Amino acid sequence: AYPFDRQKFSIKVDLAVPTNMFIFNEIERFQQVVGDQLGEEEWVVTSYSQEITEVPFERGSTNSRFTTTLLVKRNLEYYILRIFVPLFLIISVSWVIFFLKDYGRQLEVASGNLLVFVAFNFTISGDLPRLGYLTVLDRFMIVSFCLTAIVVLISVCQKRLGAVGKQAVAAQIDTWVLVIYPLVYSLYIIWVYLRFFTD
Amino acid sequence: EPIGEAPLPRLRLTDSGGKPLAFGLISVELNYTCDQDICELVVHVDGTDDSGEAVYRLLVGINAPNLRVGSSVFLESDLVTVGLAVDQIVGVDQRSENFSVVGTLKLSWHDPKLGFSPDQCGCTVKSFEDASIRAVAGEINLPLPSFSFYNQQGNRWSQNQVIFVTPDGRASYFERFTVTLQAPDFDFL
Ligand SMILES: [Ca+2]
Numbered sequence: 282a283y284p285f286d287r288q289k290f291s292i293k294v295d296l297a298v299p300t301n302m303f304i305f306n307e308i309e310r311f312q313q314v315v316g317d318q319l320g321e322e323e324w325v326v327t328s329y330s331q332e333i334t335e336v337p338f339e340r341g342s343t344n345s346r347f348t349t350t351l352l353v354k355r356n357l358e359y360y361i362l363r364i365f366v367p368l369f370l371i372i373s374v375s376w377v378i379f380f381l382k383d384y385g386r387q388l389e390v391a392s393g394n395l396l397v398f399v400a401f402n403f404t405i406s407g408d409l410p411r412l413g414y415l416t417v418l419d420r421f422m423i424v425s426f427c428l429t430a431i432v433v434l435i436s437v438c439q440k441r442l443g444a445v446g447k448q449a450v451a452a453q454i455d456t457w458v459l460v461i462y463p464l465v466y467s468l469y470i471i472w473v474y475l476r477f478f479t480d
Numbered sequence: 481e482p483i484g485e486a487p488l489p490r491l492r493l494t495d496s497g498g499k500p501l502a503f504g505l506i507s508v509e510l511n512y513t514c515d516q517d518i519c520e521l522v523v524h525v526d527g528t529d530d531s532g533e534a535v536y537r538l539l540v541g542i543n544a545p546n547l548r549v550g551s552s553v554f555l556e557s558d559l560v561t562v563g564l565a566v567d568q569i570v571g572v573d574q575r576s577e578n579f580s581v582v583g584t585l586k587l588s589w590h591d592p593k594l595g596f597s598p599d600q601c602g603c604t605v606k607s608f609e610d611a612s613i614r615a616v617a618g619e620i621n622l623p624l625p626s627f628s629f630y631n632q633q634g635n636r637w638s639q640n641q642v643i644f645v646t647p648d649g650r651a652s653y654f655e656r657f658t659v660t661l662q663a664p665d666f667d668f669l
Pocket residue numbers: 318319320321577664665666667
């Protein structure tokens with residue numbers, strides 16, 4: 282669910298003697314469990330816990346274990362402002378070109394905006410982890426590229442229609458696209474939320 | 481005896497091992513005479529039993545029934561002179577928040593227990609090279625001023641380590657280091 286994922290950091294300390302010799306009994310708090318440091322941090326801690334349990338031993342019987350768990354999350358303001366806000370403006374440029382009644386200039390603006398989308402992918406290349414599987418952020422960028430590339434295909438069809446002599450048909454396509462295009466993005470976002478977040 | 485706002489302080493006199501030897505008598509005064517071959521005393525002052533400051537003057541003496549300069553009776557800690565010089569800043573890590581430095585460190589102190597006699601060596605200075613203070617102290621079975629870098633990460637490259645002692649008892653330490661120190665107080669906002 283990158284970048285909206287929450288992880289757990291577990292620090293386990295195990296005794297190396299059987300539980301009939303030494304056993305963990307009490308937990309003392311001689312200092313703050315999570316210290317405070319100046320400045321901001323990449324991972325922020327929301328809660329923590331400490332517990333004592335028993336685990337099987339290689340000798341036999343059991344031994345004691347002391348566990349400290351920290352619940353962490355990322356910095357959401359970083360990804361929203363740096364990635365999602367610029368992405369929205371690039372996408373909205375391809376939506377607004379359908380108001381033009383000429384297609385020799387709509388086609389060249391649509392083709393030019395596809396290059397800006399690809400170039401924008403280089404800046405945020407560092408912010409995209411190089412794992413072997415798709416994440417939530419990776420899926421959204423693939424859908425956006427396909428919709429931007431389809432706009433170029435529709436523009437070519439409209440120009441051919443106008444040159445032949447049928448312009449009313451081309452004008453009706455503009456009305457349908459201006460309505461359907463914002464609808465597909467809204468529907469896809471809801472689908473992503475249902476699949477990965479609300480079970 | 482207190483100066484003002486007397487709280488009736490409690491004082492004790494025990495052995496080096498904590499065994500009591502004498503007790504105060506009510507201006508609290510106490511006396512004690514020891515006859516063993518080795519006799520070491522520890523003076524206890526207790527104030528556990530809200531008060532304003534301390535305002536105290538403690539008087540002690542040996543074979544001085546009068547009391548009320550001479551020579552020191554209490555043990556005194558050694559005084560150490562220290563200096564540090566920085567030669568270079570190798571680098572700064574802005575993700576793990578640590579930096580690397582190159583410099584020189586020097587220590588010096590006076591201890592009569594380290595003295596020797598030139599007759600048994602025909603020399604003026606003793607030498608201990610390429611060994612830390614902790615390692616040398618174990619070899620000669622004498623306490624020495626061991627130190628450490630508080631925020632050190634990993635090992636450090638030490639060069640030109642050496643200790644030299646004079647017959648009087650004056651010793652000194654010299655070392656050139658390359659260390660990496662953790663600095664979690666960095667703020668790049
Ligand atoms: Ca910091």
